[PDB]
Amino acid sequence: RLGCRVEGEGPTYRVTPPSHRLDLRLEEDLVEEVARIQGYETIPLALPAFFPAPDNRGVEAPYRKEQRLREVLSGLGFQEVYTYSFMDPEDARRFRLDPPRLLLLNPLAPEKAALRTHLFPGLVRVLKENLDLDRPERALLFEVGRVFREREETHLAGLLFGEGVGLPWAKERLSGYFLLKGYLEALFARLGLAFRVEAQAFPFLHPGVSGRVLVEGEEVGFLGALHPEIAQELELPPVHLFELRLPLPDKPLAFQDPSRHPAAFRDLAVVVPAPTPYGEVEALVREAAGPYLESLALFDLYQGPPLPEGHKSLAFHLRFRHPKRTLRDEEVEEAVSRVAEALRAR
Amino acid sequence: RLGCRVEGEGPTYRVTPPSHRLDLRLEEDLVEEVARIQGYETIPLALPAFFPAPDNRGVEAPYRKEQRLREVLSGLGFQEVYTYSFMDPEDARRFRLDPPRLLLLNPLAPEKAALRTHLFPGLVRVLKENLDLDRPERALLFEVGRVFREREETHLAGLLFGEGVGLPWAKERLSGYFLLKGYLEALFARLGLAFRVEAQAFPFLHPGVSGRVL
Amino acid sequence: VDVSLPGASLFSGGLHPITLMERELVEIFRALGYQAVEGPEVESEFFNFDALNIPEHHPARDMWDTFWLTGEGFRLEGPLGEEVEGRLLLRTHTSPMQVRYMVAHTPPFRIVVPGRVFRFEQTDATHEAVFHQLEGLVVGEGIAMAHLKGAIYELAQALFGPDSKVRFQPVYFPFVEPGAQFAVWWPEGGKWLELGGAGMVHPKVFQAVDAYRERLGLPPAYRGVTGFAFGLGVERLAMLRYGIPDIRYFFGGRLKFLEQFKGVL
Amino acid sequence: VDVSLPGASLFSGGLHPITLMERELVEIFRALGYQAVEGPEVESEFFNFDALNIPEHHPARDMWDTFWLTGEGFRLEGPLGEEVEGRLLLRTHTSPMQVRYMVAHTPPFRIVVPGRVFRFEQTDATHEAVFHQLEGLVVGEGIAMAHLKGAIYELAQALFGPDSKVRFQPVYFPFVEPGAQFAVWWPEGGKWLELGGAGMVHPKVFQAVDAYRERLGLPPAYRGVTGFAFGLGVERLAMLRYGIPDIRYFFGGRLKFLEQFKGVL
Numbered sequence A: 001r002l003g004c005r006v007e008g009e010g011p012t013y014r015v016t017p018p019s020h021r022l023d024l025r026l027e028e029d030l031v032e033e034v035a036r037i038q039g040y041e042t043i044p045l046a047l048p049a050f051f052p053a054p055d056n057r058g059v060e061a062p063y064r065k066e067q068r069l070r071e072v073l074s075g076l077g078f079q080e081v082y083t084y085s086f087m088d089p090e091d092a093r094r095f096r097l098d099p100p101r102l103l104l105l106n107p108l109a110p111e112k113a114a115l116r117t118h119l120f121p122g123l124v125r126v127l128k129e130n131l132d133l134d135r136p137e138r139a140l141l142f143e144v145g146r147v148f149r150e151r152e153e154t155h156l157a158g159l160l161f162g163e164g165v166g167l168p169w170a171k172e173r174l175s176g177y178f179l180l181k182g183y184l185e186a187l188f189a190r191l192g193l194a195f196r197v198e199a200q201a202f203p204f205l206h207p208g209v210s211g212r213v214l215v216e217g218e219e220v221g222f223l224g225a226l227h228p229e230i231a232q233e234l235e236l237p238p239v240h241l242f243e244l245r246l247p248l249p250d251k252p253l254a255f256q257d258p259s260r261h262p263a264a265f266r267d268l269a270v271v272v273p274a275p276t277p278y279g280e281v282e283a284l285v286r287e288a289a290g291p292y293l294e295s296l297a298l299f300d301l302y303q304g305p306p307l308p309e310g311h312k313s314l315a316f317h318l319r320f321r322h323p324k325r326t327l328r329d330e331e332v333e334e335a336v337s338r339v340a341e342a343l344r345a346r
Numbered sequence B: 001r002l003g004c005r006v007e008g009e010g011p012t013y014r015v016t017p018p019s020h021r022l023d024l025r026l027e028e029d030l031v032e033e034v035a036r037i038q039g040y041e042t043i044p045l046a047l048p049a050f051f052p053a054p055d056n057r058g059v060e061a062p063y064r065k066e067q068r069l070r071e072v073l074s075g076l077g078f079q080e081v082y083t084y085s086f087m088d089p090e091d092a093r094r095f096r097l098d099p100p101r102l103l104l105l106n107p108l109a110p111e112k113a114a115l116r117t118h119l120f121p122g123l124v125r126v127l128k129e130n131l132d133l134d135r136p137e138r139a140l141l142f143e144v145g146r147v148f149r150e151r152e153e154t155h156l157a158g159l160l161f162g163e164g165v166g167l168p169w170a171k172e173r174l175s176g177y178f179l180l181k182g183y184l185e186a187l188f189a190r191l192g193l194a195f196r197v198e199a200q201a202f203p204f205l206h207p208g209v210s211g212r213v214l
Numbered sequence C, D: 001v002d003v004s005l006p007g008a009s010l011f012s013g014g015l016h017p018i019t020l021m022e023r024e025l026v027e028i029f030r031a032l033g034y035q036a037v038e039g040p041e042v043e044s045e046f047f048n049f050d051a052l053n054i055p056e057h058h059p060a061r062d063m064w065d066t067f068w069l070t071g072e073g074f075r076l077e078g079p080l081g082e083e084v085e086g087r088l089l090l091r092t093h094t095s096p097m098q099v100r101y102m103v104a105h106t107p108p109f110r111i112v113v114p115g116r117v118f119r120f121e122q123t124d125a126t127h128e129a130v131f132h133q134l135e136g137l138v139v140g141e142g143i144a145m146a147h148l149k150g151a152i153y154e155l156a157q158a159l160f161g162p163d164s165k166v167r168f169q170p171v172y173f174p175f176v177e178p179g180a181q182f183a184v185w186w187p188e189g190g191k192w193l194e195l196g197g198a199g200m201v202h203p204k205v206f207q208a209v210d211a212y213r214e215r216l217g218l219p220p221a222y223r224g225v226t227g228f229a230f231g232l233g234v235e236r237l238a239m240l241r242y243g244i245p246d247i248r249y250f251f252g253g254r255l256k257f258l259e260q261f262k263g264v265l
């Protein structure tokens, strides 16, 4: 009826289409025909059942991983945000960063002619426009997106700003950089990943308040206070940032029986130059504590009148334990020196 | 071969089992037989496909709801905990609360002879024993469980204790009741639910620091 | 400023391993179209025993050490919110849910039922009185054992494998014929793990369901349909999976333990 | 103490509506055994057009307003980590992933691909240049259209219904024959919603895949297998679902907006 010639006896036929029909070349094109003429509604409903080829097994992991993370954040207290993957070539300047490696040939507008190499610029920018529309006292958010440098990459950045948290009515607040870090650390605490920060010079980050980020023993992303020069180049006050690369590495848990025998407690302080970083300090103390160091915390420190003008004090709470048996004091005040010795012996 | 008598021409047969076989009454019992004798391993592998009866549609909601919540908490900062559904009748006193409506007839021990009417007692109790084993400075956790009063009920309780949060080294902390509330409010902020508290007298709660939840 | 310094002591929460394991198992069956639903920890001797072909004075009832309860003014709800009768007890397994669900619904369907169960037993390193199980039920015309077999097989793969496999041996249960116990191949640790029991839903169970339904005014729905159900111990698997050595550890609210599973996901 | 007082100002996070919608859609297909996987936003003209039966100088290429890119030292990765060539651009839809996945895997399978796409267009109340789509692909011997039909039907039910239904009309796509557009019945608002397109994977697409595979050393895997794929606009649905009026709203980082979906789940 569609003007085709059908030769053959079956089961496979010779069908020559009318010349005015150019969309008819394959057998499938021919099937689509019977279908539309019979009516797509005359096709029944069904569901397939099969055991999927093995190489398809794990597949979801990556995606899944990204989402659990996405979720934890929101549960931790971050508002998620969605930003255009575009970038104003000009901002490569405005924000002290290298130029975009990818440019559009048909940009939507000269201010979205490149491809974001960084996420945070967009965040900060959002901050601004929010302030101008509605005046939020504080703000804490994040965004996960693809940035483009030599290779496409999945990045995660977060921004904090405002008075901080604390009692609304009551005077004080607690905010600033150490707040952002506070959250950051808790996040990894939740992901079961070891994270720490080490001062690092960043063109876009105020120095002194600059620092690279070390997830479980690795260097990825940074964290810090937004360099004021930029803070002001924009009608903006002080802001705090951090931008990482995903996927986050992962430490497969190795469960470990905790012992019942009570721990060995200790009071201890360290006096070292005002410049020295907490890091190395904890590092050393820790690396010398011995194989029975259960805990290691810092409950206090201050510059301090009663000591060397260029040195500081360190409140370190210590705990020890032995799986199989209780720890004999012989080994405690002993290993304690093992540290103190190489402590400032260095 | 199993000693059955088989009469009939098919397709349905008359099978009388030997008297020593008492487990053979139904046709199905008879099938289990061919199966074990042919070997369970000789049964192929397959997967069913069908559109489920409509009344089964929403079903997962409740469970799902409970879990999202469970998850948010952990993400907010609460350690989850699992406590026995048992209760020491004695604690009905120790903790100022009414007596358990359900008791065991074969308790595991007189200290687990009743059914928890409240969750928190168990939490607090856990707190203690933790302090005695390891000495945690602060603690924030929760637990979701079934309590038993006139009807079985799903309850959620959380406990806070310790110095509170703030700078470890730096002097101050911020904790106490208004901390717990702080978290509570944020949780609802996350669930999109309006919550508030109003002072209420509770036998087990210090007054002045007591309050019902809305 | 010293950036290496510690930030504001913020609380990092975690989840209980059972919850994690439960979750994991659930996500698995969910991918095969199973829907999760829970039942009551306090049940009626009717749903726990009678409904499933379990006799009063015969050897079967004697496979589950039950906790009997007492007390008044306690209202137990039936599948349709009605009040039901029978000696009260603590669900000895999650199977009762099998019934409540069927009474309340129409085939075909696929459900899975996580839940804490209770058995009167002396608590040791590998035995508890309080633990969790995960019941599974799939009813519909045409269901056969091969389906159950595939079901379990998919589960194996999902857990270990594709270098893992399944073992099905015949076993006896009053609510299924054929009945079977199934083990799973663990490629890593190299051993066979007895996971749980399963089988083709027993005719007298279906009978029971319909009978109670009509007594409730509903039309029969399980005549001419087939089905299989299974149930497995969660703690065991969780222990093998997350590598825990003492089952008592789960109900032992120790933090040093619980935190160990903070980032499990 | 005054308990009615406000507690410590703690930060309450939230999620972006697209993420929520995405999530919801994903959980849906996951229950039918679909697995989620993502592709790259920056693609090669080869995967975006050529692989799928899309010609250079013919009317088809002319249905997608593409963003062309430029720049050096940028490394684009192929399905097997190899470096691939072709004019660079911004994925115009998520279909390219269809290919990358097939080249890299073996049937039978079910996947779903969420992802942000880009189209050169003027941004108005119902049209964006940057938005998201969700691609779906199911390949295997025996696959037919009825499967696609059921697939979509299940999706409908999952979203509205069981008082909702599906509409399938024939439409033209270079990578599927038969091709079709499908609408869904919204019982509440009472109208038909055009959701997305779908169809039976085109033979030349399968051809392409195998051809590139062999060029990569792999044996052909898509001869003698069938398949269907579909793709739908996420923003549209999210708007209808969560009741949003302006599509521009999504990329407009306004908080008063974003927070509105805090407790969506």
Ligand SMILES: N[C@@H](Cc1ccccc1)C(=O)O
Pocket: C092, C093, C094, C095, C133, C135, C173, C176, C196, C197, C198, C199, C229, C230, C231, C232
């Ligand atoms: N819950 C059952 C396990 C099982 C379930 C279903 C069928 C067979 C066995 C038990 O207590 O052992």
Ligand SMILES: N[C@@H](Cc1ccccc1)C(=O)O
Pocket: D092, D093, D094, D095, D133, D135, D173, D176, D196, D197, D198, D199, D229, D230, D231, D232
């Ligand atoms: N992503 C396609 C939608 C589609 C997918 C698969 C088959 C048919 C249509 C589009 O751009 O329109």
Ligand SMILES: [Mg+2]
Pocket: A023, A024, A029, A030, A032, A033, D177
């Ligand atoms: Mg045609």
Ligand SMILES: [Mg+2]
Pocket: B023, B024, B029, B030, B032, B033, C177
């Ligand atoms: Mg038998």
